[PDB]
Write a protein that binds this DNA or RNA. Structure first.
Ligand SMILES: [K+]
Ligand SMILES: [K+]
Ligand SMILES: [K+]
Ligand SMILES: [K+]
Ligand SMILES: [K+]
Ligand SMILES: [K+]
Ligand SMILES: [K+]
Ligand SMILES: [Mg+2]
Ligand SMILES: [Mg+2]
Ligand SMILES: [Mg+2]
Ligand SMILES: [Mg+2]
Ligand SMILES: [Mg+2]
Ligand SMILES: [Mg+2]
Ligand SMILES: [Mg+2]
Ligand SMILES: [Mg+2]
Ligand SMILES: [Mg+2]
Ligand SMILES: [Mg+2]
Ligand SMILES: [Mg+2]
Ligand SMILES: [Mg+2]
Ligand SMILES: [Mg+2]
Ligand SMILES: [Mg+2]
Ligand SMILES: [Mg+2]
Ligand SMILES: [Mg+2]
Ligand SMILES: [Mg+2]
Ligand SMILES: [Mg+2]
Ligand SMILES: [Mg+2]
Ligand SMILES: [Mg+2]
Ligand SMILES: [Mg+2]
Ligand SMILES: [Mg+2]
Ligand SMILES: [Mg+2]
Ligand SMILES: [Mg+2]
Ligand SMILES: [Mg+2]
Ligand SMILES: [Mg+2]
Ligand SMILES: [Mg+2]
Ligand SMILES: [Mg+2]
Ligand SMILES: [Mg+2]
Ligand SMILES: [Mg+2]
Ligand SMILES: [Mg+2]
Ligand SMILES: [Mg+2]
Ligand SMILES: [Mg+2]
Ligand SMILES: [Mg+2]
Ligand SMILES: [Mg+2]
Ligand SMILES: [Mg+2]
Ligand SMILES: [Mg+2]
Ligand SMILES: [Mg+2]
Ligand SMILES: [Mg+2]
Ligand SMILES: [Mg+2]
Ligand SMILES: [Zn+2]
Lengths: 110, 150, 43, 154, 305, 118, 99
RNA sequence: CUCGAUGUUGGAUCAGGACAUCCCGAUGGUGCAGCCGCUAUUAAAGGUUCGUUUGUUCAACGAUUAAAGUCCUACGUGAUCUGAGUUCAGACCGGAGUAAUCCAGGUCGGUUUCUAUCUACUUUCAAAUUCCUCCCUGUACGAAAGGACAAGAGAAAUAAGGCCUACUUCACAAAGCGCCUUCCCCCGUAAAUGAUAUCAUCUCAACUUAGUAUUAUACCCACACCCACCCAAGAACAGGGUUUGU
RNA sequence: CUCUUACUUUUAACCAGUGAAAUUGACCUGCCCGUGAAGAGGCGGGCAUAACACAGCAAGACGAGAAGACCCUAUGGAGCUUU
RNA sequence: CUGAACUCCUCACACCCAAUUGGACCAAUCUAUCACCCUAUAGAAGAACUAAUGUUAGUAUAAGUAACAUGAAAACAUUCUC
RNA sequence: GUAAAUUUAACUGUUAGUCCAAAGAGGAACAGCUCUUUGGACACUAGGAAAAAACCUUGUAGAGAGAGUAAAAAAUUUAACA
């Protein structure tokens, strides 16, 4: 089946510019109270989620320097310590991961 | 087109002819060439015809600018401000004499479609027709099947 | 319903045409003229 | 017609689906936090919850060891399940994982999600917080509560 | 210019408080309509030939077998009445119809998910919102005061009813499952044509007649099953045992009323009119109401003697 | 008073109004009597709709037409009336409507026998 | 081409419009179009449709005088049709002769 | 009309329509006792089988049915299918011809493209038709053989519309081989009273009756919480729920 | 096959990225009957009719494709046979 | 009474047949001689395109359609699945 | 009563015809059939017969918001009898 006639630009503007074709404005946008950047109400902040992944990656690179190979996971808990911190009362008998950096303010010691 | 062009209603300039007739042609500007076959008919119109035409029309100021040109033209300006430009290129004296006289007779209003061949500001003298013109009045102005004093 | 076979006003089976009253009067008006023409062509 | 169907159709078939979910669960036990498409995480989240239930049964239960051996491709993670993860959620009876939606990835604009095991040693995610109790609306409700409580005691 | 929901700005301490607050209000609103005969009821007229009373709005629980005293087996459908009340009343004149309409709702729903115009209608009525609202055509002598509760004993065993509900939605379907078309054979050369409609019309007309059976969305429409009798009535849970099947899925709201079939005309002479009022009943009814030909579970085993 | 119209001849029985629902077997044919008992304003409405020009303005002219089966008319429409058009047909009188003057004015034409039983 | 052939329709539709307006103005006075036009010619009044339609709108008191004249000449014609010539012609039935 | 292409048999699929009615309905006549039939009037709502041989349409035959209707729709329908036949290129038989080759002939084999631009259509929402059985009844009828109608009751088939308690395919569900429901009519005639025409006469005389439904009623009927989540809702959108928004 | 049904994959539809082809006189591109180069979306008489996308269907547009291979014509060709 | 392009009225007049035939004008270009904001008289000619399934190029329609593509997590080291 | 006709000189195109009336042939006293003859119309305009090549009215050309006309609409309703 082939077109019997050529469709005019008037017919085609009415199909292309139909409200269903148009992009719909979004009203679920708001500002992140921490950084001030934009975000959706149901989605995490891309900026704050990015700074968590940069630090999480650094911690995961230190974990590799301790295991020193594959299939070498521990059977104990793990703790992250920063310059100016020592094992806590509850952080006894764990795998401490030393980080040469000041503890992030958002990263609260538990 | 009529649909592909504009239109106007029949009219006059300052109710001309009502109290007095005023010629609307106000100025005529000819551009002839001393040399040039296109202007041959325009040169002979300037030698014998234009002078007698100005005597009859003293309210029209006529300017004859003889300069080099390939297409001679006559520009007519009217009181209302309209300007009509025309070409007398390769036209005989008789053709230029009837054209210039046509310009003197015109009013300056755009030569376009005229809707009606008539115009009157007072079309009625006994009263423009309206639905109640030929209807009789009823006692107490009652309506069809209207109970009075209920 | 109401088909006339073929073309309407030709052939074997045509659409019937009926004589109106003014068609009669129109023909009679012509006859009265030509009947008076015979009278002036007789002298 | 799909009325009642609870399981999704991913991968190349039923078996490939279990193998996709197994590779995500295995990576979740090693790192305790991963990012993957939202639908694939919501489908694996159920298995991550029931895997801890088998770790609470103990490593002496053959049935529980046959599940971990199958669901954990890396065999160094099996002791971590019975000795690290299960003890951690000993007091809790449910809600071992939290799943959160994250910005769509750039390559294919796919809906993404991050899933983790509660109690990990990783930097806290920027969890959503409810409006403070000191706000205008919440202070108008706190006052209403007090009266309704005060009248009831009377 | 952003929308909001009921718990978008509430804190961790107020969410439980608000939930319990509105929950306790619904309880008090529903427990304040159990005495309709003392709260200035409207006149109670007797039953006259040609009278039409209100119906109910029940919830489809499921299906259960049922045996009679002859040994034959019958399958019944359990319809539970929960939070059924009369919302409003419109007279014959204002109805623009032969009859007079009575509005009834069922299945209390949340107030946080309804429209303001609907919330205010229930606010002055003293009731929580209803999920489904159906209209019943009655006579002038069957009008009931709004806010009056309705129960399953409004019907009696041995009475036929007409159940209306939306059918199960099957989405866009072809002609083989939607209209019962035979289709085309599987083998013997068939080329990509096994479940197609085939010819849709003749060539002469050059078009397709309106109403031509084509693929499309099937189900999810209102259907009525006429001629269903009540085998059993449970008063403790307000449940109606209807014969056979009814349209719709489990846990769906259905419209129930007396049957319009001529054979069952003028059979509501011994039925409650306008409706059953337990508040004013001179004697409470039994736990369950069975039919004469129904063998109760406690009854002894059948013996053809 | 569109319910009390009068047809000439045997048009109540002979005249037929035909329609189609668009569906197969949806061609209906009712007589003027059947339609009149079902809709007392359809006959006058269908006669006017067929006399108006075949253009888009016709549906606008029909909104300015108000038909009522009986002599009752709403107050609003009854307060904006201007003129009552005369009836086209002259309603003839029944033999019980003639006065004793007209009956005695018309002469008797024949002399019946006195021995006829009648 | 449409503009060239439309000059025949314009003249035709105008006369159709005038006649419709004359017919309407004559029914207000209880007359029909043929009885007005035909009997104004019998009174030697040569007024065309265009003028008559203009008078019915802008000169209503003059159009009623023309309708009364046509109705008067129409009634004289009936009276003459009842006689056998003995009775003389009507006052408005006389014809001015031009030599 | 069409050869700068209107694809041609039969069948499958879906059927639309006419009535010149095959069955079912209502009537008149009979060389109609009854049971079966012949004939004519009216009726097109509903229905009108499965198989063996044949490419078949037809036809024959077998077993049934209340009945297995006659026709039109591009001998309906190949941008939905099928290619057995017909109808290219190969080949054989018989026959014709000096041969090439050919035949109303028979026989085996032989590629069926198309991503839908437009028109149209995609829930005509909801009254159902028929057979059999029992009974009436061994009654009416009738020499005998033989053998009803109406009423009533019950049980089925098909169709339409739904459902999953069990059975079965199956298993948070979808299905049938399973279960539930299914409500009005139609007009041909037969009869009274009674004029034209003082009997009579059903009346394109006035009139009365069999004899008629505004097809009845039923269904549907509220509306910015709505970002997000769930769903027995769904292609998308829409719709329902969230007083179950860690 | 009676007589179909269920599930899986592909396709599918939605989001994102990339991005063809035949076809196309112009089009503001309805139905019935009739007419007519004899089968009408466009003519006549009637009926219908706010605008607009998406998904499906294949009755029609004598739908697309290949200047019909059947048939006939051309003092147009060629292959084969021959008294 | 309505009713034509028939006829009258006011003014004007060569100004409605295929093939074919006769005649009156003319765009642009070059040349001769004029002209000199674009013309004149003549002489010449590759001298005028709404149509050849025309030739070349550009851009639309179909159509943002048909169709095409990257196994999973992660420390990007590595491991897992097939 | 009219204004054409023949001759001389020089050329092209047309030479695949349709309906209506009338006289006939063939066919079937069928064909929107085929073949001759007489005339008309069409293959040019307009109006009318519903739409309309062939029927009727009418032809010589423009402008007009004047007029008189041509052709031009279908009629019909039924069976007593000594
Ligand atoms: K004919
Ligand atoms: K059609
Ligand atoms: K052909
Ligand atoms: K008689
Ligand atoms: K199955
Ligand atoms: K099609
Ligand atoms: K084609
Ligand atoms: Mg025809
Ligand atoms: Mg996939
Ligand atoms: Mg569904
Ligand atoms: Mg099948
Ligand atoms: Mg194939
Ligand atoms: Mg297949
Ligand atoms: Mg073609
Ligand atoms: Mg018949
Ligand atoms: Mg049938
Ligand atoms: Mg065919
Ligand atoms: Mg086809
Ligand atoms: Mg074959
Ligand atoms: Mg073969
Ligand atoms: Mg041989
Ligand atoms: Mg083979
Ligand atoms: Mg095919
Ligand atoms: Mg019986
Ligand atoms: Mg009698
Ligand atoms: Mg008598
Ligand atoms: Mg895309
Ligand atoms: Mg083409
Ligand atoms: Mg046609
Ligand atoms: Mg579409
Ligand atoms: Mg297709
Ligand atoms: Mg060819
Ligand atoms: Mg040759
Ligand atoms: Mg040669
Ligand atoms: Mg005229
Ligand atoms: Mg003339
Ligand atoms: Mg002239
Ligand atoms: Mg020039
Ligand atoms: Mg030159
Ligand atoms: Mg050239
Ligand atoms: Mg060009
Ligand atoms: Mg070209
Ligand atoms: Mg497309
Ligand atoms: Mg695709
Ligand atoms: Mg692929
Ligand atoms: Mg010749
Ligand atoms: Mg012929
Ligand atoms: Zn942030």
């Amino acid at each position: 089946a082939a077109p019997k006639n050529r469709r005019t630009i008037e017919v085609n503007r009415c199909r292309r510019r139909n409200p269903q074709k148009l992009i719909k404005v979004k009203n679920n946008i708001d500002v992140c109270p921490e950084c001030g950047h934009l975000k959706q109400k149901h989605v995490l902040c891309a900026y704050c989620y990015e700074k968590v992944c940069k630090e999480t990656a650094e911690i995961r690179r230190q974990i590799g320097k301790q295991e020193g190979g594959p299939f070498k996971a521990p059977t104990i808990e793990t703790v992250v310590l920063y310059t100016g911190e020592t094992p806590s009362e509850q952080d006894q008998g764990k795998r401490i991961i030393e980080r040469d950096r000041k503890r992030p303010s958002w990263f609260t010691q538990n | 087109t009529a649909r592909g062009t504009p239109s106007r209603f029949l009219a006059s300039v300052l109710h001309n002819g009502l109290g007095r007739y005023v010629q609307q042609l106000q100025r005529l500007s000819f551009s002839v060439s001393r040399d040039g076959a296109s202007s041959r008919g325009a040169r002979e119109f300037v030698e014998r015809e234009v002078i007698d035409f100005a005597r009859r029309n003293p309210g029209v100021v006529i300017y004859v600018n003889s300069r080099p040109c390939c297409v001679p033209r006559v520009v007519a300006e009217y009181l209302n401000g309209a300007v009509r430009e025309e070409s007398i290129h390769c036209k005989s004296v008789e053709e230029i004499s009837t054209l210039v006289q046509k310009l003197a007779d015109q009013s300056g209003l755009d030569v376009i479609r005229i809707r009606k061949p008539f115009h009157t500001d007072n079309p009625s003298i006994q009263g423009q027709w309206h639905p109640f013109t030929n209807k009789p009045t009823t006692f107490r102005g009652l309506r069809p099947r209207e109970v009075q004093d209920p | 319903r109401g088909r006339i076979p073929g073309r309407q006003w030709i052939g074997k089976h045509r659409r019937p045409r009926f004589v109106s009253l003014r068609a009669k009067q129109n023909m009679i008006r012509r006859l009265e003229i030509e009947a008076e023409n015979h009278y002036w062509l007789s002298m | 017609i799909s009325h009642g169907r609870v399981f999704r159709r991913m991968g190349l078939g039923p078996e490939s689906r279990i193998h996709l979910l197994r590779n995500l669960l295995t990576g979740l036990v090693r790192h305790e936090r991963i990012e993957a498409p939202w639908a694939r995480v919501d489908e694996m989240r159920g298995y991550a919850e029931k895997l801890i239930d088998y770790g609470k049964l103990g490593d002496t239960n053959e049935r529980a060891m046959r599940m971990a051996d199958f669901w954990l491709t890396e065999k160094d993670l099996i002791p971590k399940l019975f000795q690290v993860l299960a003890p951690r959620y000993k007091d809790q009876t449910g809600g071992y994982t939290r799943m959160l939606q994250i910005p769509n990835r750039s390559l294919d604009r796919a809906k993404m999600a991050v899933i983790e095991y509660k109690g990990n040693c990783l930097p806290p995610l920027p969890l959503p917080r409810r409006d403070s109790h000191l706000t205008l609306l919440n202070q108008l409700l706190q006052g209403l509560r007090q009266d309704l409580r005060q009248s009831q005691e009377a | 210019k952003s929308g909001t929901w009921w718990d978008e700005h509430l804190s961790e301490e107020n969410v439980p408080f608000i939930k319990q607050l509105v929950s306790d209000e619904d309880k008090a609103q529903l427990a304040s309509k159990l005495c309709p005969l003392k709260d200035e009821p409207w006149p109670i007229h007797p039953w006259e030939p040609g009278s039409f009373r209100v119906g109910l709005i029940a919830l489809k629980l499921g299906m259960m077998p049922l045996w009679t005293k002859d040994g034959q087996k019958h399958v019944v459908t359990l319809l539970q009445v929960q939070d059924c009340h009369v919302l409003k009343y419109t007279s014959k004149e204002n109805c623009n119809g032969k009859m007079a309409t009575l509005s009834v709702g069922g299945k209390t729903v949340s107030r946080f998910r309804k429209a303001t115009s609907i919330l205010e209608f229930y606010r002055e009525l003293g009731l929580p919102p209803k999920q489904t609202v159906k209209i019943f055509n009655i006579t002038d002598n069957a009008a009931i005061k709004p806010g009056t509760p309705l129960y399953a004993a409004h019907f009696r065993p041995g009475q036929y009813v007409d159940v209306t509900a939306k059918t199960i939605g099957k989405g866009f379907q072809g002609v083989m499952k939607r209209w019962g078309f035979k289709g085309q054979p599987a083998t013997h050369g068939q080329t990509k044509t096994h479940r197609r409609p085939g010819a849709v019309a003749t060539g002469d007309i050059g078009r397709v007649w309106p109403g031509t059976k084509m693929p499309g969305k099937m189900g999810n429409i209102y259907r009525t099953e006429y001629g269903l009798k009540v085998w059993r009535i449970n008063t403790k849970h307000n449940i109606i045992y209807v014969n056979g099947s009814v349209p719709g899925h489990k846990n769906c709201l259905v419209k129930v009323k007396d049957s319009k079939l001529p054979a069952y005309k003028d059979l509501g002479k011994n039925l409650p009119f306008p409706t059953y009022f337990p508040d004013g009943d001179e004697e409470e009814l039994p736990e369950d109401l069975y039919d004469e030909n129904v063998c109760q579970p406690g009854a002894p085993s059948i013996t053809f003697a | 008073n569109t319910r009390h119209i009068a047809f000439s001849g045997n048009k109540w029985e002979q005249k037929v109004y035909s329609s189609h629902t668009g569906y197969p077997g949806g061609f209906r044919q009712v007589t003027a009597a059947q339609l009149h008992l079902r809709d007392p304003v359809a006959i006058v409405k269908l006669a006017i709709y067929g006399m108006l020009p075949k253009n888009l303005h016709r549906r606008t002219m029909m909104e300015r037409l108000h038909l009522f089966p009986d002599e009752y008319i709403p107050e609003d429409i009854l307060k904006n009336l201007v003129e009552e058009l005369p009836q086209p047909r002259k309603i003839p009188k029944r033999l019980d409507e003639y006065t004793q003057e007209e009956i005695d004015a018309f002469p008797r034409l024949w002399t019946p026998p006195e021995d006829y039983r009648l | 081409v449409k503009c060239t052939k439309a000059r025949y329709l314009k003249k035709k539709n105008m006369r159709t419009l005038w006649i419709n307006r004359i017919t309407a103005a004559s029914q207000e006075h209880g007359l029909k179009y043929p009885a007005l036009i035909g009997n104004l010619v019998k009174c030697q009044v040569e007024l065309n449709r265009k003028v008559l339609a203009d008078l019915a709108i802008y000169e209503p008191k003059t159009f009623k005088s023309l309708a009364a004249l046509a109705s008067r000449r129409r009634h004289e014609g009936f009276a003459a049709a009842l006689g056998d010539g003995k009775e003389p012609e009507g006052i408005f039935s006389r014809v001015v002769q031009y030599h």
